[PDB]
Amino acid sequence: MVIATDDLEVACPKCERAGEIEGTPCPACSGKGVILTAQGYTLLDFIQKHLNK
């Protein structure tokens, strides 16, 4: 394990572990516990072609 979720998902401004903000889904994430980044999107968008596309 040389890579962590820090290079794919980053903790949101408030809902990085709560899953919600102010009672509603955070503008960046919605109950995920972080947010997607350039790498995460590449590793997700690419897999979205062989998994969901």
Q: Where along the sequence are the contacts to a second copy (CB under 8 A)? A: 1-5, 7-9, 32, 36-53
Q: Which residue has the tokens 């820090």?
A: 6
Minimal distance in Å, beta carbon 2 to Zn ion? 22
Smallest distance from a second copy to CB 30, Å: 9
In the numeric block, which tokens belong to residue 24? 């509603």
Neighbour-count burial of 12, counting CB atoms closer than 10 A to its CB (0-12 exposed, 13-18 middle, 19+ buried): buried
Name the binder of 17 from Zn ion, a second copy, none, CB < 5-8 A by kind. Answer: none
Nearer to a second copy, 4 or 24 (CB): 4
As a whole number of angstroms, the distance between CA 9 and CA 18 comes to: 15
